């Protein structure tokens, strides 16, 4: 069955805020563990540590976020999982100082997230797959 559209929106925007914080200048790598687990957590966690190691950071402007589809699979006492398909329109700037100019992008892309509810009532993003447009 379908998940509430605003609840998927709030999950994806907390993820996007945490991504901005972890990849940002303050380098809140710990905060990734609030929203991510498993392979997605490992990937973004190594990206955050690499960025902080090379003294680069990221600035974001999230122009549009829209939940295209959202489903929840309450698989009994084994836990629950969910799948969210969202279209992101976002601009970003990598502040690196070993180059004369900072690299920027503006991208509209679809992304599917697979999340799993932990046994504490909280949701955590576990896997993701982009299709860029």
């Amino acid at each position: 069955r379908p998940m509430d559209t605003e609840e998927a929106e709030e999950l994806v925007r907390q993820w996007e805020n945490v991504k901005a914080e972890a990849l940002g200048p303050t380098h809140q790598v710990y905060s990734l563990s609030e929203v991510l687990d498993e392979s997605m957590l490992v990937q973004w966690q190594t990206l955050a540590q690499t960025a902080e190691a090379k003294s680069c950071y990221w600035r974001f402007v999230l122009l549009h976020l829209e939940v295209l589809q959202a489903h929840i699979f309450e698989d009994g006492i084994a836990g629950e999982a969910a799948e969210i398909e969202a279209l992101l329109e976002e601009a970003a700037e990598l502040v690196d100082e070993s180059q004369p100019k900072n690299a920027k992008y503006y991208s509209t892309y679809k992304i599917r997230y697979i999340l799993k509810k932990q046994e504490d009532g909280l949701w955590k993003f576990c896997q993701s797959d982009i299709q860029i447009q």
Binding site: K19, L23, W44, L47, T50, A51, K54, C56, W58, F60, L88, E90, A92, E93, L94, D96, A103, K104, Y105, S107, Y109, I111, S128, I130, I132
Partner: peptide, 9 residues
């Protein structure tokens, strides 16, 4: 090295 597009997701 790092590329700016690594932060989409």
């Amino acid at each position: 090295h790092l590329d700016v597009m690594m932060a989409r997701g």
